[PDB]
Amino acid sequence: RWQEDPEPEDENLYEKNPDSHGYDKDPAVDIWNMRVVFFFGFSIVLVLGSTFVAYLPDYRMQEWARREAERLVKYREAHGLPIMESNCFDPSKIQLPE
Amino acid sequence: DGPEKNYERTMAILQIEAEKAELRLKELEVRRLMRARGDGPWFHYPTIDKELIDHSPKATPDN
Amino acid sequence: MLKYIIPTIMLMPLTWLSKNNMIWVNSTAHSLLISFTSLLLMNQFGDNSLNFSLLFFSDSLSTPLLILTMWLLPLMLMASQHHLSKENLTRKKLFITMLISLQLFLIMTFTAMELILFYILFEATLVPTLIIITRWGNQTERLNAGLYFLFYTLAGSLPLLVALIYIQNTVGSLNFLMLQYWVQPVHNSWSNVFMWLACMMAFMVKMPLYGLHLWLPKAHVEAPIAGSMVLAAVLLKLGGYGMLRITLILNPMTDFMAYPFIMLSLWGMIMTSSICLRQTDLKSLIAYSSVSHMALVIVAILIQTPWSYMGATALMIAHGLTSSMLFCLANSNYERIHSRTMILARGLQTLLPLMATWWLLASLTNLALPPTINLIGELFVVMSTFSWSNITIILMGVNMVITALYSLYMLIMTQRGKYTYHINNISPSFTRENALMSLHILPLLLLTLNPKIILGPLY
Amino acid sequence: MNPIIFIIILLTIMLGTIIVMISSHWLLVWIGFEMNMLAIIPIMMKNHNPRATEASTKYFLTQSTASMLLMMAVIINLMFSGQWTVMKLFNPMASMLMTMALAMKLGMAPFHFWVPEVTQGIPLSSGLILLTWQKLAPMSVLYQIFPSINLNLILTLSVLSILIGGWGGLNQTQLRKIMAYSSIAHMGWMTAVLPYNPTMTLLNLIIYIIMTSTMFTMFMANSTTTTLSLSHTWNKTPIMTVLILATLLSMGGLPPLSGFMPKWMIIQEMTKNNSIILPTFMAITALLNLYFYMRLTYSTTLTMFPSTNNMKMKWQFPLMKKMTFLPTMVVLSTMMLPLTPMLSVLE
Amino acid sequence: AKTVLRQYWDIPEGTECHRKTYATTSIGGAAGLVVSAYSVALKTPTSFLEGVARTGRYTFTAAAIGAIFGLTSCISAQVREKPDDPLNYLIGGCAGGLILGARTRSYGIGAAACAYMGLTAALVKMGQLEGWQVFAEPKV
Amino acid sequence: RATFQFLPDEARSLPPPKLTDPRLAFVGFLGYCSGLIDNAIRRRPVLLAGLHRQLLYITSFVFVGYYLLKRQDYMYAVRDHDMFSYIKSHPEDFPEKDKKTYGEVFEEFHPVR
Amino acid sequence: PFFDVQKRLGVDLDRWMTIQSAEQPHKIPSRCHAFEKEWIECAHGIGSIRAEKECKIEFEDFRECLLRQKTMKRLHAIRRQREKLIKEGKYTPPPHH
Ligand SMILES: CCCCCCCCCCCCCCCCCC(=O)OC[C@H](COP(=O)(O)OCCN)OC(=O)CCCCCCCCCCCCCCCCC
Ligand SMILES: CCCCCCCCCCCCCCCCCC(=O)OC[C@H](COP(=O)(O)OCCN)OC(=O)CCCCCCCCCCCCCCCCC
Ligand SMILES: CCCCCCCCCCCCCCCCCC(=O)OC[C@H](COP(=O)(O)OCCN)OC(=O)CCCCCCCCCCCCCCCCC
Ligand SMILES: CCCCCCCCCCCCO[C@@H]1O[C@H](CO)[C@@H](O[C@H]2O[C@H](CO)[C@@H](O)[C@H](O)[C@H]2O)[C@H](O)[C@H]1O
Ligand SMILES: CCCCCCCCCCCCO[C@@H]1O[C@H](CO)[C@@H](O[C@H]2O[C@H](CO)[C@@H](O)[C@H](O)[C@H]2O)[C@H](O)[C@H]1O
Ligand SMILES: CCCCCCCCCCCCO[C@@H]1O[C@H](CO)[C@@H](O[C@H]2O[C@H](CO)[C@@H](O)[C@H](O)[C@H]2O)[C@H](O)[C@H]1O
Ligand SMILES: CCCCCCCCCCCCO[C@@H]1O[C@H](CO)[C@@H](O[C@H]2O[C@H](CO)[C@@H](O)[C@H](O)[C@H]2O)[C@H](O)[C@H]1O
Ligand SMILES: N=C(N)NC(=N)NCCc1ccc(I)c(Cl)c1
């Protein structure tokens, strides 16, 4: 054995503070902690951040690509060209081995 | 940042990283040659300094 | 990245110079403001990544992981401040410092443009994580858990260090942009078989790979709640992020080197999902769930297709928010009954109704209910694996059946049935606990509306 | 010992080492070692007890034997070259003898048996000199003769030192023996890279000396020489437990701490020479060092061991030990990694 | 050791197996003698006879491991008709590890030795094929 | 170059490190950390106690660090100077290659199926 | 020397006795003075890596002077042949031997 403190009893925050938010023993600090979590977490990051994401300017240019593709399809069908060719690079610029 | 600034900032980054990469390869091949042949400033292990020799006439002639 | 590194550092003076009663209020408030500004990283282009300087860059892979990392620090603070209430004031400040220093290494790790800088920061996260587990864990086994965590990682990391330096000697650079243009194929040889292994084993241990996962049930269980939140949500994703980057320089050798590790994963997930059915410890059950989910990420990274990389990226983000929420849910029970045994406290939906809603929502996301991003990622990985080989649908399908069984088994056992008669200290859920739960689930469910920002570079 | 006598003897320890480092003549190198050996023995016996007598006797026998082998190598070199210049040796048998002699003086395995015993038997202050300052003279000689050193011999000594140093530390509870086996292991890294890049040998030597001095100074501050007496430190000077933790993590080579820098650079220089198997083996074997460093951190900083009632009487007095340079040393021991390119000052 | 090592690598795989077993047995016996010399010097035997008993027990054990390895790896190469395959050294390596478990009477040491002797031997053949250097010559 | 000299005279043809060098600032920060550790181990008020002592910790770290960085920069200049001079002296060992475009160079395609 | 304070300070602590061809009391020469002088001047400044091959002739002559190994090998042969011939009676030494 030895000289050791006994395990301290369990402390229920609601006995001293029935209106406890669960942050701090001090009721004034406890209210402030709840306020910053809710305002900065829900009001700022989640609400404004969601609005920011929704109005991102053409994320990864998927909207420009659709506009560009329409321009190409219109030009190619009008002039009789194929819509898409199997060759990505012009074969005149390629020198095959052998 | 507009695409042009990011695009041309990337080329500035690529140039420095490409220049450094080439120098690193050159350094490894320079080190390999200097060590094998002993003909460069690196891996220059000292030999006895010849200013230590005394060229005065000696007590006997044949030396 | 200095607009995130510097303010993250400034959290340390803020915590140390705060009034003794405001350390949690101040750090939580300001880590949320940092979390807000991280959304500026979503200035992503279709062709070019966002390259800030010679040191740091951001792309659609690192950006969501960075946003998850900076969001988790506020949540780890709220989760911790209850069980550290009796702690000495200076030791409380040190605990917060470890979390801040962990965030600093993480945000630099995910954005380092040079692989050796990534390696040093990848390794630097061990120190704060090890200190958090061993200093502030509750049980005797936390000391052994730290040793397993440390040496499982290092046993794989040290070969990686040699491999990276060898790659720099022969290629002349480890900058990731350079590696995209100077990459050469890897031709078969016993020398290259071991270069491949040294490049992949460090990341597999972190995932973890089935077979090399034993450190995780120990570490994820012995850690304090904040330690478990970061271990599951982010640190496991260093393995996935590392693999996603280094596999660029391993082709075409990945064609046949992936086979032993795809087999370990495909069979591993069924083995680790089945384990969860007979787990007696709630935290241990959640930990083994992470192994099952990260097995899909390993397979998706190895088969190396556009759909599997999108699915892997979605899974890593979705798992981070879900697994973190589940640990927090189980912690709230533990802070009431001081035991991790799952069968100890039952019928809790009768005593804690709202908190039973969080349990349900967390469970549904875990079993990948559509259209959650958990399902989006898990479905994209299954689509690409079917093409890789049609028979994999059998193993993916079975895992989806088993995953639902243990996800709802945990929900049923703890929340439904009859309450345990002799447990009479189930106090009503605190505001802190309810808010902590909703800060996981709400962002997770919102991302369903705009999933393209968590699908990675191949979107 | 009279304070003036102690200072004069310490200056003779340094003068002997400095003679070795400025000498262009093998005879003066041998004189420097002899002068150094002469002045350190009274420092080992300074406490006059049977264990210090045994420690000094074992040290004298080992060092005096090595000096004979060193002088034999010099005389063979004289016969086959007719000169005394300190540089590469001109006879392979002279190179073997000089290399074995310097390994003996360094306490490298398998010539290592004296290091754990001698360090344990002398005070902490004397052990600090033995494991730091005394490495300078043999290392400075190796730095100059390495072109003629047999590659298989020096790498065999380095590998055995890393293994035996790592394994030997696992079974120790005495702090001085833990530092001794740590020193044996670290010597292996120093001489493993010597044939490839001697500059990296000096960086490893300098960083090792800083970290070793930091640990010995912290042990001296609390007058702790066992694992258990060091486990009371949390209940006296909490700050010291944190400094010990940081240094021990650093000595284990963990990023982002300074002690990772030498291992990092040594692996780089070895891989540049297509040495892959050896650096991988060395790094994995060094995990044994980290293991028994971690045990110390567990019993010192990361847990709170039982204390005694009489310890309360210590709370009422401040640390009175000099702890010279300790604030600087601990910072350098832990926070140098961002300045790694500074190693070019050693070229 | 340099000469006894060259002999082994200078006689092709599967050709002159008996000669191969001579070289590997010679290596194993030398290793056992070195172990005996250090053991006898650092843990003095109770009597001269007991020192001889310990030496002959280590030297035979070490020679048996060398004999079974050099034979089995040569037989595998001959039978399989694949002289360049590391797998032969794995089979030879594991067999040596098994013999070590036999001479020690301990299935656990037999199992662990088979795995690490087998893998180590396989790594040796790969390094020979690919030119891996253990004590690499300084070049840069 | 010069024997047992910290800063050979040829080093003065190089620009000195700026006093706002980021590495010098880090070194100064280390001096500050040393000052705080000095207060902590002696149980003095860490931030406030002995500001003169803390000042000397910062100043002495910066003072030594400035000369180390000056020598560090010099030694890397010497490395570059040696390497390029050697390349000039042995052109045949460092030939300038003929560069081919990807349209001409054959690279094998490995499908990911 | 590891630290060349001798060169910087311009003080000769021990390099006066490093070589046998340095200045001696009363100009007494060593037996191999010329050979050492020739090897030292050949290798001066070019470094050991080059000197080990480009001054091999000089070093071999210097080594032969120092240890005379080849000279005794030659005298051994002549002395062995003579003792063989004498006993066989084939050879008679001249009167002055
Ligand atoms: C900069 C770039 C380079 C990057 C490398 C890493 C940089 C950091 C290097 C660290 C070097 C060591 C300096 C660390 C300073 C530690 C400060 C500290 O410990 O706080 C002081 C306090 C002492 O307590 P006390 O004096 O009694 O005051 C009353 C409170 N009890 O201490 C205590 O009371 C603690 C007592 C309980 C023990 C808790 C132990 C767990 C916390 C350890 C945190 C520090 C870990 C540092 C290791 C590196 C981290 C990455
Ligand atoms: C802009 C600056 C950003 C900060 C960068 C930090 C980088 C790591 C620097 C390590 C050196 C830390 C300073 C040495 C420790 C001194 C502080 C201490 O020991 O105790 C805390 C002390 C307050 O306690 P007290 O002793 O009572 O003094 C009262 C003074 N008001 O003193 C105090 O009041 C607060 C002093 C600061 C507390 C430091 C806590 C140690 C942190 C170690 C964690 C590792 C660092 C993070 C890793 C990433 C590195 C960038
Ligand atoms: C590699 C990149 C990084 C660069 C690393 C550079 C490392 C080397 C740089 C030097 C590091 C040591 C700096 C020490 C600063 C603290 C000195 C101090 O504050 O002393 C205060 C006082 C004594 O001051 P005093 O000696 O009287 O000043 C007049 C000098 N003629 O008395 C005191 O109370 C001080 C007690 C604390 C001192 C600890 C014990 C050491 C004793 C130091 C004596 C004075 C040092 C003067 C430093 C000048 C160096 C230029
Ligand atoms: C979890 C662990 C996973 C382990 C995975 C194991 C993967 C095994 C890959 C084996 C293929 C290695 O790659 C193979 O190496 C040998 C090197 O000897 C090369 O072949 C080379 O050596 C062999 C000798 O054996 C000769 O037959 C051949 O003429 C020569 O070119 C082959 O051209 C190459 O196909
Ligand atoms: C831990 C679970 C263990 C489960 C067991 C897993 C066994 C895994 C064995 C690893 C793969 C070994 O088999 C591997 O097959 C691929 C082909 O697909 C070969 O790949 C190579 O050979 C093929 C033809 O054979 C060529 O097109 C080409 O040279 C190359 O692709 C490898 O040379 C071979 O090493
Ligand atoms: C290509 C060549 C391959 C060469 C292979 C070389 C293999 C290495 C052999 C090293 C020498 C043998 O090593 C030694 O074996 C004996 C087995 O009798 C062990 O000895 C132990 O096992 C048995 C019974 O328990 C007894 O010998 C002894 O009682 C006990 O100490 C030693 O613990 C071990 O140190
Ligand atoms: C517990 C694990 C401990 C660490 C294990 C480390 C494994 C290291 C494997 C050995 C490395 C390679 O080992 C060595 O390679 C070289 C080639 O470079 C071979 O060298 C050989 O090549 C030629 C032909 O190839 C031979 O005629 C010659 O005898 C020899 O020079 C050696 O025969 C081999 O022994
Ligand atoms: N590898 C060796 N043994 N020698 C060596 N350092 N070679 C590299 C050459 C070098 C490196 C840095 C600098 I600064 C300078 Cl001036 C020269």
Tab-separated table of C-alpha atoms in Angstrom, chain A:
chain	number	residue	atom	x	y	z
A	1	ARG	CA	0.000	0.000	0.000
A	2	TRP	CA	0.996	3.645	0.501
A	3	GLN	CA	-0.331	7.124	1.327
A	4	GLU	CA	-2.694	8.016	-1.516
A	5	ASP	CA	-5.748	10.192	-1.977
A	6	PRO	CA	-9.060	8.364	-2.499
A	7	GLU	CA	-10.720	8.685	-5.876
A	8	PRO	CA	-12.685	11.961	-5.812
A	9	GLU	CA	-16.444	11.819	-6.105
A	10	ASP	CA	-18.271	12.546	-9.342
A	11	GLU	CA	-19.373	16.149	-9.880
A	12	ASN	CA	-22.681	16.779	-11.653
A	13	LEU	CA	-22.576	20.277	-13.122
A	14	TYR	CA	-26.361	20.589	-12.825
A	15	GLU	CA	-26.488	20.484	-9.016
A	16	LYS	CA	-24.730	23.825	-8.559
A	17	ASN	CA	-25.892	25.300	-11.895
A	18	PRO	CA	-29.224	23.944	-13.171
A	19	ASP	CA	-28.835	26.215	-16.214
A	20	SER	CA	-25.390	24.779	-16.944
A	21	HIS	CA	-24.425	24.572	-20.596
A	22	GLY	CA	-21.724	22.032	-19.739
A	23	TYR	CA	-18.723	24.231	-20.563
A	24	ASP	CA	-17.485	25.728	-17.287
A	25	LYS	CA	-18.245	25.627	-13.581
A	26	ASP	CA	-18.358	29.429	-13.563
A	27	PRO	CA	-21.840	30.386	-14.843
A	28	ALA	CA	-20.550	33.536	-16.556
A	29	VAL	CA	-17.713	31.755	-18.356
A	30	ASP	CA	-20.102	28.910	-19.150
A	31	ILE	CA	-22.484	31.273	-20.953
A	32	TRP	CA	-19.654	32.942	-22.881
A	33	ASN	CA	-18.249	29.597	-24.011
A	34	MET	CA	-21.654	28.575	-25.361
A	35	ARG	CA	-21.979	31.926	-27.125
A	36	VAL	CA	-18.665	31.702	-28.990
A	37	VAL	CA	-19.240	28.086	-30.029
A	38	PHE	CA	-22.687	28.858	-31.413
A	39	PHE	CA	-21.976	32.236	-32.992
A	40	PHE	CA	-18.611	31.379	-34.533
A	41	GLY	CA	-19.518	27.764	-35.263
A	42	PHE	CA	-23.101	27.947	-36.496
A	43	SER	CA	-23.650	31.600	-37.417
A	44	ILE	CA	-20.265	32.251	-39.049
A	45	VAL	CA	-18.560	29.107	-40.324
A	46	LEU	CA	-21.591	26.994	-41.193
A	47	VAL	CA	-24.013	29.665	-42.450
A	48	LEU	CA	-21.636	32.109	-44.143
A	49	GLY	CA	-19.244	29.333	-45.136
A	50	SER	CA	-22.065	27.443	-46.828
A	51	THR	CA	-23.037	30.649	-48.629
A	52	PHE	CA	-19.430	31.179	-49.687
A	53	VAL	CA	-19.222	27.652	-51.104
A	54	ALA	CA	-22.500	27.967	-53.013
A	55	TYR	CA	-21.268	31.121	-54.782
A	56	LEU	CA	-17.766	29.917	-55.580
A	57	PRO	CA	-16.804	31.307	-59.001
A	58	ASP	CA	-17.020	28.342	-61.372
A	59	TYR	CA	-15.182	25.824	-59.213
A	60	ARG	CA	-12.615	24.022	-61.391
A	61	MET	CA	-14.033	25.698	-64.525
A	62	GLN	CA	-16.740	23.125	-65.188
A	63	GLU	CA	-19.086	25.874	-66.405
A	64	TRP	CA	-16.520	27.336	-68.798
A	65	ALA	CA	-15.938	23.856	-70.212
A	66	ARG	CA	-19.643	23.453	-70.974
A	67	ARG	CA	-19.732	26.868	-72.649
A	68	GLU	CA	-16.566	26.026	-74.579
A	69	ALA	CA	-17.906	22.643	-75.684
A	70	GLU	CA	-21.075	24.246	-77.034
A	71	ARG	CA	-18.947	26.682	-79.024
A	72	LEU	CA	-16.922	23.822	-80.503
A	73	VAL	CA	-19.949	21.670	-81.330
A	74	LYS	CA	-21.657	24.590	-83.062
A	75	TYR	CA	-18.561	25.423	-85.107
A	76	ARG	CA	-17.769	21.825	-86.041
A	77	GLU	CA	-21.269	20.797	-87.102
A	78	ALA	CA	-21.736	23.959	-89.176
A	79	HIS	CA	-18.469	23.416	-91.073
A	80	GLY	CA	-18.950	19.673	-91.548
A	81	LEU	CA	-16.028	18.662	-89.341
A	82	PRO	CA	-16.182	15.632	-87.044
A	83	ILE	CA	-17.379	16.416	-83.540
A	84	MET	CA	-14.362	14.658	-82.023
A	85	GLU	CA	-11.337	13.030	-83.642
A	86	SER	CA	-9.664	9.894	-82.323
A	87	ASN	CA	-6.257	11.620	-82.406
A	88	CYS	CA	-5.479	14.105	-79.651
A	89	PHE	CA	-2.299	15.326	-81.355
A	90	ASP	CA	-1.789	16.075	-85.026
A	91	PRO	CA	0.001	13.069	-86.592
A	92	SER	CA	2.088	15.355	-88.820
A	93	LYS	CA	4.002	16.340	-85.663
A	94	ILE	CA	4.716	12.721	-84.686
A	95	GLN	CA	7.622	10.551	-85.845
A	96	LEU	CA	6.840	6.882	-85.342
A	97	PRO	CA	9.777	4.582	-84.515
A	98	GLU	CA	11.135	1.779	-86.725
